[PDB]
Design a protein around this motif. Structure first.
Motif, PDB file in Angstrom:
ATOM      1  N   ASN A  52      24.492   3.485 -70.541  1.00 46.57           N
ATOM      2  CA  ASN A  52      23.461   2.627 -69.989  1.00 46.57           C
ATOM      3  C   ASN A  52      22.404   2.332 -71.037  1.00 46.57           C
ATOM      4  OD1 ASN A  52      20.758   4.265 -69.415  1.00 46.57           O
ATOM      5  ND2 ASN A  52      22.477   5.630 -68.972  1.00 46.57           N
ATOM      6  N   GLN A  53      21.800   1.154 -70.917  1.00 43.28           N
ATOM      7  CA  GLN A  53      20.714   0.770 -71.802  1.00 43.28           C
ATOM      8  C   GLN A  53      19.751  -0.135 -71.054  1.00 43.28           C
ATOM      9  OE1 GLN A  53      21.831  -0.577 -75.735  1.00 43.28           O
ATOM     10  NE2 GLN A  53      19.897  -1.694 -75.945  1.00 43.28           N
ATOM     11  N   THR A  54      18.461   0.074 -71.282  1.00 43.62           N
ATOM     12  CA  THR A  54      17.421  -0.640 -70.561  1.00 43.62           C
ATOM     13  C   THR A  54      16.612  -1.497 -71.523  1.00 43.62           C
ATOM     14  OG1 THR A  54      17.292   1.305 -69.133  1.00 43.62           O
ATOM     15  CG2 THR A  54      15.638  -0.393 -68.832  1.00 43.62           C
ATOM     16  N   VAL A  55      16.284  -2.710 -71.090  1.00 38.24           N
ATOM     17  CA  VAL A  55      15.393  -3.603 -71.818  1.00 38.24           C
ATOM     18  C   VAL A  55      14.144  -3.812 -70.980  1.00 38.24           C
ATOM     19  CG1 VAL A  55      17.215  -4.739 -73.102  1.00 38.24           C
ATOM     20  CG2 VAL A  55      16.549  -5.626 -70.891  1.00 38.24           C
ATOM     21  N   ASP A  56      13.015  -3.995 -71.654  1.00 42.62           N
ATOM     22  CA  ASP A  56      11.732  -4.198 -71.002  1.00 42.62           C
ATOM     23  C   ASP A  56      11.398  -5.681 -71.022  1.00 42.62           C
ATOM     24  OD1 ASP A  56      11.435  -1.389 -70.735  1.00 42.62           O
ATOM     25  OD2 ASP A  56      10.661  -1.289 -72.784  1.00 42.62           O
ATOM     26  N   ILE A  57      10.837  -6.176 -69.931  1.00 41.22           N
ATOM     27  CA  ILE A  57      10.508  -7.588 -69.780  1.00 41.22           C
ATOM     28  C   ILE A  57       8.993  -7.725 -69.757  1.00 41.22           C
ATOM     29  CG2 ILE A  57      10.763  -9.629 -68.351  1.00 41.22           C
ATOM     30  CD1 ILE A  57      13.278  -7.982 -67.156  1.00 41.22           C
ATOM     31  N   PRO A  58       8.407  -8.565 -70.608  1.00 49.27           N
ATOM     32  CA  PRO A  58       6.952  -8.769 -70.578  1.00 49.27           C
ATOM     33  C   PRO A  58       6.452  -9.370 -69.274  1.00 49.27           C
ATOM     34  CG  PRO A  58       7.885  -9.527 -72.651  1.00 49.27           C
ATOM     35  CD  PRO A  58       9.041  -9.204 -71.771  1.00 49.27           C
ATOM     36  N   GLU A  59       5.131  -9.454 -69.116  1.00 50.36           N
ATOM     37  CA  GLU A  59       4.570  -9.968 -67.871  1.00 50.36           C
ATOM     38  C   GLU A  59       4.724 -11.479 -67.756  1.00 50.36           C
ATOM     39  OE1 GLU A  59       0.594  -8.846 -67.051  1.00 50.36           O
ATOM     40  OE2 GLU A  59       1.103  -6.794 -66.462  1.00 50.36           O
ATOM     41  N   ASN A  60       4.577 -12.199 -68.867  1.00 46.31           N
ATOM     42  CA  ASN A  60       4.593 -13.656 -68.842  1.00 46.31           C
ATOM     43  C   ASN A  60       5.969 -14.240 -68.560  1.00 46.31           C
ATOM     44  OD1 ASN A  60       5.710 -12.824 -71.220  1.00 46.31           O
ATOM     45  ND2 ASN A  60       4.208 -13.820 -72.551  1.00 46.31           N
ATOM     46  N   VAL A  61       7.017 -13.423 -68.572  1.00 48.58           N
ATOM     47  CA  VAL A  61       8.385 -13.874 -68.363  1.00 48.58           C
ATOM     48  C   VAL A  61       8.998 -13.050 -67.242  1.00 48.58           C
ATOM     49  CG1 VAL A  61       9.207 -12.350 -70.167  1.00 48.58           C
ATOM     50  CG2 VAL A  61      10.628 -14.214 -69.452  1.00 48.58           C
ATOM     51  N   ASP A  62       9.810 -13.690 -66.405  1.00 48.21           N
ATOM     52  CA  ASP A  62      10.516 -12.977 -65.354  1.00 48.21           C
ATOM     53  C   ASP A  62      12.000 -13.315 -65.384  1.00 48.21           C
ATOM     54  OD1 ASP A  62      10.235 -15.567 -64.479  1.00 48.21           O
ATOM     55  OD2 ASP A  62       9.897 -15.020 -62.383  1.00 48.21           O
ATOM     56  N   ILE A  63      12.810 -12.343 -64.983  1.00 46.58           N
ATOM     57  CA  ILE A  63      14.259 -12.424 -65.092  1.00 46.58           C
ATOM     58  C   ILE A  63      14.854 -12.308 -63.699  1.00 46.58           C
ATOM     59  CG2 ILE A  63      16.304 -11.183 -65.836  1.00 46.58           C
ATOM     60  CD1 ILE A  63      15.202 -10.789 -68.468  1.00 46.58           C
ATOM     61  N   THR A  64      15.755 -13.227 -63.368  1.00 42.95           N
ATOM     62  CA  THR A  64      16.469 -13.240 -62.103  1.00 42.95           C
ATOM     63  C   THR A  64      17.951 -13.029 -62.376  1.00 42.95           C
ATOM     64  OG1 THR A  64      14.843 -14.733 -61.111  1.00 42.95           O
ATOM     65  CG2 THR A  64      16.976 -14.584 -60.034  1.00 42.95           C
ATOM     66  N   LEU A  65      18.610 -12.273 -61.507  1.00 43.97           N
ATOM     67  CA  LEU A  65      20.031 -11.996 -61.631  1.00 43.97           C
ATOM     68  C   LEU A  65      20.785 -12.650 -60.487  1.00 43.97           C
ATOM     69  CD1 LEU A  65      20.045  -8.256 -62.654  1.00 43.97           C
ATOM     70  CD2 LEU A  65      20.600 -10.208 -64.078  1.00 43.97           C
ATOM     71  N   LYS A  66      21.834 -13.391 -60.823  1.00 46.77           N
ATOM     72  CA  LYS A  66      22.799 -13.898 -59.853  1.00 46.77           C
ATOM     73  C   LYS A  66      24.142 -13.319 -60.271  1.00 46.77           C
ATOM     74  CE  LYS A  66      20.557 -18.026 -58.176  1.00 46.77           C
ATOM     75  NZ  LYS A  66      20.381 -17.202 -56.949  1.00 46.77           N
ATOM     76  N   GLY A  67      24.430 -12.115 -59.793  1.00 45.82           N
ATOM     77  CA  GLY A  67      25.594 -11.390 -60.249  1.00 45.82           C
ATOM     78  C   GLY A  67      25.441 -10.959 -61.690  1.00 45.82           C
ATOM     79  N   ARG A  68      26.232 -11.555 -62.576  1.00 47.80           N
ATOM     80  CA  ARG A  68      26.133 -11.310 -64.006  1.00 47.80           C
ATOM     81  C   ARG A  68      25.525 -12.488 -64.751  1.00 47.80           C
ATOM     82  NH1 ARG A  68      32.216  -9.521 -64.709  1.00 47.80           N
ATOM     83  NH2 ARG A  68      32.208 -10.066 -62.488  1.00 47.80           N
ATOM     84  N   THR A  69      24.974 -13.461 -64.034  1.00 46.69           N
ATOM     85  CA  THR A  69      24.292 -14.590 -64.647  1.00 46.69           C
ATOM     86  C   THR A  69      22.801 -14.290 -64.699  1.00 46.69           C
ATOM     87  OG1 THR A  69      25.956 -16.087 -63.732  1.00 46.69           O
ATOM     88  CG2 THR A  69      23.931 -17.059 -64.575  1.00 46.69           C
ATOM     89  N   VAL A  70      22.256 -14.220 -65.906  1.00 48.85           N
ATOM     90  CA  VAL A  70      20.852 -13.915 -66.131  1.00 48.85           C
ATOM     91  C   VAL A  70      20.104 -15.227 -66.303  1.00 48.85           C
ATOM     92  CG1 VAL A  70      19.226 -12.601 -67.507  1.00 48.85           C
ATOM     93  CG2 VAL A  70      21.576 -11.815 -67.270  1.00 48.85           C
ATOM     94  N   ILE A  71      19.048 -15.410 -65.514  1.00 51.44           N
ATOM     95  CA  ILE A  71      18.127 -16.529 -65.652  1.00 51.44           C
ATOM     96  C   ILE A  71      16.806 -15.961 -66.143  1.00 51.44           C
ATOM     97  CG2 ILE A  71      16.842 -18.320 -64.470  1.00 51.44           C
ATOM     98  CD1 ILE A  71      20.040 -17.098 -62.916  1.00 51.44           C
ATOM     99  N   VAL A  72      16.368 -16.395 -67.313  1.00 46.96           N
ATOM    100  CA  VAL A  72      15.156 -15.884 -67.932  1.00 46.96           C
ATOM    101  C   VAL A  72      14.145 -17.020 -67.941  1.00 46.96           C
ATOM    102  CG1 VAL A  72      14.157 -14.886 -69.972  1.00 46.96           C
ATOM    103  CG2 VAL A  72      16.438 -14.249 -69.312  1.00 46.96           C
ATOM    104  N   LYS A  73      13.067 -16.868 -67.177  1.00 51.38           N
ATOM    105  CA  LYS A  73      12.071 -17.915 -66.995  1.00 51.38           C
ATOM    106  C   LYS A  73      10.779 -17.466 -67.662  1.00 51.38           C
ATOM    107  CE  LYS A  73      10.084 -21.564 -65.013  1.00 51.38           C
ATOM    108  NZ  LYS A  73       9.266 -21.805 -66.233  1.00 51.38           N
ATOM    109  N   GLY A  74      10.372 -18.187 -68.700  1.00 51.97           N
ATOM    110  CA  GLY A  74       9.155 -17.884 -69.408  1.00 51.97           C
ATOM    111  C   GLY A  74       8.261 -19.097 -69.533  1.00 51.97           C
TER     112      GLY A  74
END
Ligand SMILES: [Mg+2]
Ligand SMILES: [Mg+2]
Ligand SMILES: [Mg+2]
Ligand SMILES: [Mg+2]
Ligand SMILES: [Mg+2]
Ligand SMILES: [Mg+2]
Ligand SMILES: [Mg+2]
Ligand SMILES: [Mg+2]
Ligand SMILES: [Mg+2]
Ligand SMILES: [Mg+2]
Ligand SMILES: [Mg+2]
Ligand SMILES: [Mg+2]
Ligand SMILES: [Mg+2]
Ligand SMILES: [Mg+2]
Ligand SMILES: [Mg+2]
Ligand SMILES: [Mg+2]
Ligand SMILES: [Mg+2]
Lengths: 139, 252, 201, 190, 175, 109
Positions: D7-29
């Motif tokens: 396992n590995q974890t990444v940190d997401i800043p406050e100004n950007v949010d990440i949505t998951l649709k299964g294995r599709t990552v949507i990164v909105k900044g």
RNA sequence: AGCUACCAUCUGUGGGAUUAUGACUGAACGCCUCUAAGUCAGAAUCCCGCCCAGGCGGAACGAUACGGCAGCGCCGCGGAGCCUCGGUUGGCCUCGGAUAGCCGGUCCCCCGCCGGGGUCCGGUGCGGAGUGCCCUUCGUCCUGGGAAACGGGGCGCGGCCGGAGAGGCGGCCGCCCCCUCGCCCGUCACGCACCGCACGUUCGUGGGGAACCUGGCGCUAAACCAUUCGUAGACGACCUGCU
RNA sequence: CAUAGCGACGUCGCUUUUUGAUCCUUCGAUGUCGGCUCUUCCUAUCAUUGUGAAGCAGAAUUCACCAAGCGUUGGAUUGUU
RNA sequence: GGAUGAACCGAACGCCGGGUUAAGGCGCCCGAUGCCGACGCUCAUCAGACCCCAGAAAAGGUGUUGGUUGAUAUAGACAGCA
């Protein structure tokens, strides 16, 4: 995405094998393919068991790994797994298919008659609902 | 063992079944790719080879030895009296190819066109299309034809016009006209259907199809030469004079 | 059985599906396979394309017109795969091969019928998730099939019509659930009969 | 060997949010939206915090080959975050010995015209990938700036230019002419 | 030697009494064999290598199966063995997790066949010990020494692919 | 009023690869796909019913074109629920892939 | 005239996936890395196009046999019979698909009163389940209770709509004629109850071919030979002409 | 400067386009050299296409990769290969 | 039975019925695994697939899987950056 895990205290349903149709508790894990398995209240003595014949349920018991059958049985009896299992949709699906399989010829005749009447009433009401919904008048 | 010296093959295998053509007219086999952006137009025409002559013209090709020089060039005259449009065919694309969906023929089909449907026009009663032309006139038939055009409009992907030549304007023995399907390119299916409908029974001159100084393709059947040997047919090397059983043959 | 067994070729492995179908048609059953462009073959696309090109190279040196006939449509490819598993040079094998129909896409006789699935031939259970595979439609298109695009458009049209039908079916199911809720005191006499015998949990 | 869990974890800043649709990552900044599906990798993607936005990638019962994909997914997601927060900017210097390389930027920085590469009359037209803008820097003399959000697309466009300007039939140790990626950085330098 | 599921045997033998030594010494061996006949054959094979003993010049005074003294306890087994490869002989130390010693040795035979193509006549087990979890060296064995062990079953492959052989629903993998 | 016989398919004769023992036939009964499920059908009468050109006498009826070859299920075959059957005359090879009826007649339940 | 010559003249063509190779991002292996997962460019090669032939392979369309008893088509399940080929023994009228995830329902918003989103609620060893669902055959007569009664049955008419990938199918209205029966639980007796026995039970008014009678609505043609042509030709075949 | 290009002493192969070895088929007969003609195939690629390397500045050349689509000629002497 | 085959493997033979085997097999051709078979290994842009037997070596690989020996390291490894 996963919600059910192989762990110590996880209650699994045995799908096939010599103990098919019973509940067991996972006591320990051996080499990625087997588990020390004990159903003390479901008449399954402690033994190794492959993960292929297990189907994990949502019940987890609280005992340390490789504890004795005494403690596993105490944890099973407290917060009774038998009753909580029998109250699930899974268990009554199993029970319903069991009694459907054991249904006899007279029972099949009676079920045919009851199903006939039930289906006729339901479809008459469906036609009524369709006819009612057909009264639409709006821009 | 390998042949002693390399020599290219005699003749081409691309035209390999060197048989008499199953047709006399010469069929298109490929129309230009249709793009709806272009205006509605026809893609083919039927002419008759009259003969050859030669011209004189000044060349406008810079960098050549003949730039601003007068050259003579052999040209071929192809008499092209205007075609007459008598029918419309629609095709639909299927996972097995294009198939013919519907055919609508005009009223008043000319006699020379009608001769194409008869092997013996002399002995026939000339009955062809005489019951079909009535549905252009009765009401139910007109509604049926409108339904056919609507179905072509909403189902067909390509349409063609059946057009025939006018043999009465030509000096030949033959009076039986030539029919062919000319694909209508350049537009939507509705637009080309309206164009074809307004061109029904009408004359299309070669001016409306082809223009000056453009490159076209000529499809035809070559001159027949009968049964020929390998030396004339494939232009193989003639065997020496000393050959016993004949020298106009292939040795091995 | 007696009815015509209609199988959907999408997601199925070519040889597994062909073996099942060959046994079925030899047992006197009539089988129709649709969407032969959706059939998968294990192994990467280049691997399978080289296999088909090696097949293409096998022609009779004296007369290729007599030689092996390399069929390019996915339906015909699957049909030849089944013919390879039938004894097609006997009358029994020829009748078995006659009982089989294969289509690219789904023609109107079967576009409005239920399609079976053969789990023993499904890629999802027969291949490891990390293995590469190839699509029969793409393979056919790259070895000479000419109707990949038109089949795609017709499949999209059929899918839109099926979506409309499914929405009507879901509306009817919702209405039937509402009807069952509406008539409860008038149904529960027979509902308990079904429940005691296991139908309708 | 099959490792139970990697396992590995990444940190997401406050100004950007990440949505998951299964294995599709949507990164909105702030700089837009990026979207990438990892259906070719059998992993479990989870979002953990409602305060710090950790995204964890789990692989269960993997072998040597598919333990290598966890860090790959984490790096791709971090590059997406970097693209939607700071953006990617590749600076390409054009080098030449004799013939200056004339670069003309066509519509909205989507087409690049190289005119006089090694003095040949052929004109090179390079089409940038969508979402990537090319421009001629106002700071240095012979320098292109490629700005975008997807590092994949920006670097692929830079590689398209670099491989377009390629010397042939010559000792490329001597004939060094071409356009080369000088540096890779961000925008706003935060 | 072929296999099956193996079972441990205590085999005790000795030379026949001769008028040079009237009470020859007794030797004991642990033999993992499918049955007692193979156990006695392997005992003679090993004592012929170690001592100057032969089946005709000696006898077996005991051959009894050794039951597992704790078949309800997961434990780690370290097995020292030697086997003949295609191009030499090697000594190996392997580790397994099991409830029974004979089960671990059977695992070892299957594993040696699987990884090194070694056959049971090549393999020569020379020591089997129950090692503590803190003394394990193989990471595959070590990764199960977790009191809070937890993992799912991610991709459940359908095994009743022929019951039914034809169906309308495609199988589910997530559970 | 009802079918009253189980559907079976005449799959072929007992055979090796290059030898064929026509005196016994292999039947595939519908719904029976394991060897342990074939115990019900052991000893049951089976019939190959066909039609011909000339009329033949029907027991308890008028002559028609229906003919029948009688036999019975003798034992299971393989693990997949197929059975062996002995018929009074060896089944014609034209019947392979055609219907055999298992009549339920000599019932043991 | 015809044939004919690099011995004259004219014409000779587009795309796709990719090889070698060079790369992008990126781990393995906190670095690097064209590779592992994922991407890009890429050729006299490969496949297709263009071109040649056109399947015991299809499509659309035309005309479809008399000046005389003479043939044919469609309509009727119209009838009575033949000859011949036999299979089968209830139906399922359909989402798309994922598989490290799915299915169903509902409020706020958007695309012109339905779909698509975001919430929320459920189910998930699939129960809105193909290990499933539907239909269900003894027939009638008395005779009550429940479902219904806005109901059923029309080889009954007329109109409309949808479906083109092989539509060869499906649905909706208006008028008319009938039963208030058919579905569940009951009351009541009867039917050849053919005296233990098989091929029974369906699709089915099956398919195909001749023929008889019966009514209605319709049609009155070509092909080949012979002759001719010479754009053709060993002969066949082919292009043609004939108030 | 071992390995741009070469490779001594050794050693491992492939091919059946050389010549041997053998004598299995053919002695109630398989017409025996070369040339001419004509088709096809192989690649261990001479040229051409796209490439990598150099003791590749350019030009010329050399080594290697994918690659057999296409081409590989006119003559004196000699029956000649 | 080895697809095929004088010699290989099983087994030797009057005409038949039932049962069971050998060698060999059990996706389909083609009888039989349509077992919820067990444990691993392996991706091949010439994969591999069974005595005789019908094709391959030396030498290589930071592909992966085991194993042997040695070495360093919280008195801080290795690798990166300085
Ligand atoms: Mg040559
Ligand atoms: Mg002579
Ligand atoms: Mg990094
Ligand atoms: Mg140079
Ligand atoms: Mg010339
Ligand atoms: Mg590459
Ligand atoms: Mg590309
Ligand atoms: Mg000899
Ligand atoms: Mg001779
Ligand atoms: Mg002879
Ligand atoms: Mg000869
Ligand atoms: Mg080569
Ligand atoms: Mg044999
Ligand atoms: Mg062999
Ligand atoms: Mg026998
Ligand atoms: Mg076999
Ligand atoms: Mg079989």
């Amino acid at each position: 995405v996963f919600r059910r895990f192989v762990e110590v205290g996880r209650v699994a349903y045995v799908s096939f094998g010599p103990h098919a149709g019973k509940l067991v508790a996972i006591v320990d894990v051996i080499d990625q393919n087997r588990a020390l398995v004990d159903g003390p209240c479901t008449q399954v003595r402690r033994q190794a068991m492959p993960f292929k014949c297990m189907q994990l349920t949502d019940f987890i018991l609280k005992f340390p790994h490789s504890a004795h059958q005494k403690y596993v049985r105490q944890a099973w009896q407290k917060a009774d797994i038998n009753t909580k299992w029998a109250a699930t949709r899974w268990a009554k699906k199993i029970e319903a298919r069991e009694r459907k399989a054991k249904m006899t010829d007279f029972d099949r005749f009676k079920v045919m008659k009851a199903k006939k009447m039930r289906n006729r009433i339901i479809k008459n009401e469906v036609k009524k609902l369709q006819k009612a919904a057909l009264l639409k008048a709006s821009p | 063992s390998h042949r002693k010296f390399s020599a290219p093959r005699h003749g081409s295998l691309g035209f390999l079944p060197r048989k008499r053509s199953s047709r006399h007219r010469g069929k298109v086999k490929s129309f230009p790719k249709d793009d709806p952006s272009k205006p509605v137009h026809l893609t083919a025409f039927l002419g008759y080879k009259a003969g050859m002559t030669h011209i004189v013209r000044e060349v406008d090709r810079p960098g050549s030895k003949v730039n601003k020089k007068e050259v003579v060039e052999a040209v071929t005259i192809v008499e092209t009296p205007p075609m007459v449009v008598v029918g419309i065919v629609g095709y639909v694309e299927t996972p097995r190819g294009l198939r013919t969906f519907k055919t609508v023929f005009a009223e008043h089909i000319s006699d020379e066109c009608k001769r194409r449907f008869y092997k013996n026009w002399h002995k026939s009663k000339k009955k062809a299309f005489t019951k079909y032309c009535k549905k252009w006139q009765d009401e139910d038939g007109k509604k049926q034809l409108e339904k056919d055009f609507s179905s072509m409009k909403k189902y067909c992907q390509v349409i063609r016009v059946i057009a025939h030549t006018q043999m009465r304007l030509l000096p030949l023995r033959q009076k039986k006209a030539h029919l062919m399907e000319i694909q209508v390119n350049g537009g939507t299916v509705a637009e080309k259907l309206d164009w074809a409908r307004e061109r029904l029974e009408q004359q299309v001159p070669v001016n409306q199809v082809f223009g000056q100084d453009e490159m076209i393709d000529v499809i035809g059947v070559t001159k027949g030469k009968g049964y020929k040997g390998v030396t004339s047919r494939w232009h193989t090397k003639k065997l020496p004079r000393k050959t016993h059983r004949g020298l106009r043959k292939v040795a091995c | 059985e007696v009815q015509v067994l209609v199988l959907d070729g999408r997601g199925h492995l070519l040889g597994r599906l062909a073996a099942i179908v060959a046994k079925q048609v030899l047992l006197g059953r009539k089988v129709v396979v649709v969407r032969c462009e959706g059939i998968n073959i294990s192994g990467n696309f280049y691997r399978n394309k080289l296999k088909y090109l090696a097949f293409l190279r096998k022609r009779m040196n004296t007369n290729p017109s007599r030689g092996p006939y390399h069929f390019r449509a996915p339906s015909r490819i699957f049909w030849r795969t089944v013919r390879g598993m039938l004894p097609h040079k006997t009358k029994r094998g020829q009748a078995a091969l006659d009982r089989l129909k294969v289509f690219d896409g789904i023609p109107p006789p079967y576009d409005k019928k239920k399609r079976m699935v053969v789990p023993a031939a499904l890629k999802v259970v027969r291949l490891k998730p990390t293995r590469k595979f190839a699509y029969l439609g793409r393979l056919a298109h790259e070895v000479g099939w000419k109707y990949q695009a038109v089949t795609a458009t017709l499949e999209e049209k059929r899918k839109e019509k099926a979506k409309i039908h499914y929405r009507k079916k879901k509306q009817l199911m919702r209405l039937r659930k509402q009807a069952e809720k509406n008539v409860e005191k008038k149904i529960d006499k027979y509902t308990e009969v079904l429940k005691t015998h296991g139908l309708l949990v | 060997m099959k490792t139970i869990l990697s396992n590995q974890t990444v940190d997401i800043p406050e100004n950007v949010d990440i949505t998951l649709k299964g294995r599709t990552v949507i990164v909105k900044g702030p700089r837009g939206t990026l979207r990438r599906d990892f259906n070719h990798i059998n992993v479990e993607l989870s979002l953990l915090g409602k305060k710090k936005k950790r995204l964890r990638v789990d692989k269960w019962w993997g072998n040597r080959k598919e333990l290598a994909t966890v860090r790959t997914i984490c790096s791709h997601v971090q590059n997406m975050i970097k693209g939607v927060t700071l953006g990617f900017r590749y600076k390409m210097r054009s080098v030449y010995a004799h013939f200056p390389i004339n670069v003309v930027i066509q519509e909205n920085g989507s087409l690049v015209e190289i005119r006089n590469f090694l003095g040949e009359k052929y004109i090179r037209r390079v089409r940038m990938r969508p979402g990537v803008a090319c421009s001629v820097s106002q700071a240095q003399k012979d320098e292109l700036i490629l700005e975008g959000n997807d590092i994949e697309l920006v670097s692929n466009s830079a590689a398209l230019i670099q491989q377009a300007t390629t010397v042939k039939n010559k000792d490329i140790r001597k004939f060094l002419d071409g356009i080369y990626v000088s540096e890779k950085g961000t925008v706003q330098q935060a | 030697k072929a296999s099956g599921t193996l079972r441990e045997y205590k085999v005790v033998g000795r030379c026949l009494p001769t008028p040079k030594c009237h009470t020859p010494p007794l030797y004991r061996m642990r033999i993992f064999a499918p049955n007692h006949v193979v156990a006695k054959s392997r005992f003679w094979y090993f004592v012929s290598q170690l001592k100057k003993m032969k089946k005709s010049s000696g006898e077996i005074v005991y051959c009894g199966q050794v039951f597992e003294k704790s078949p309800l306890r997961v434990k780690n087994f370290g097995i020292w063995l030697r086997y003949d490869s295609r191009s030499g002989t090697h000594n190996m130390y392997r580790e397994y997790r099991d409830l029974t010693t004979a089960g671990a040795v059977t695992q070892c035979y299957r594993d040696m066949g699987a990884r090194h193509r070694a056959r049971a006549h090549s393999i020569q087990i020379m020591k089997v010990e129950e090692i503590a979890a803190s003394k394990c060296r193989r990471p595959a064995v070590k990764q199960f020494h977790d009191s809070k062990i937890k993992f799912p079953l991610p991709h459940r492959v359908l095994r009743r692919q022929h019951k039914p052989r034809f169906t309308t629903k495609r199988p589910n993998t997530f559970f | 009023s009802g079918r009253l016989w189980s559907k079976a398919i005449f799959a072929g004769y007992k055979r090796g690869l290059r030898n064929q023992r026509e005196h016994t036939a292999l039947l595939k009964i519908e719904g029976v796909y394991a060897r342990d499920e074939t115990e019900f059908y052991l000893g049951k009468r089976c019939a190959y019913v066909y039609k011909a050109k000339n009329n033949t006498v029907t027991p308890g009826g008028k002559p028609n074109k229906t003919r029948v070859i009688w036999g019975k299920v003798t034992r299971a075959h393989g693990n997949s629920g197929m059975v062996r059957a002995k018929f009074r005359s060896n089944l014609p090879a034209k019947a392979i892939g055609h219907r055999i009826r298992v009549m339920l007649y000599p019932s043991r339940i």
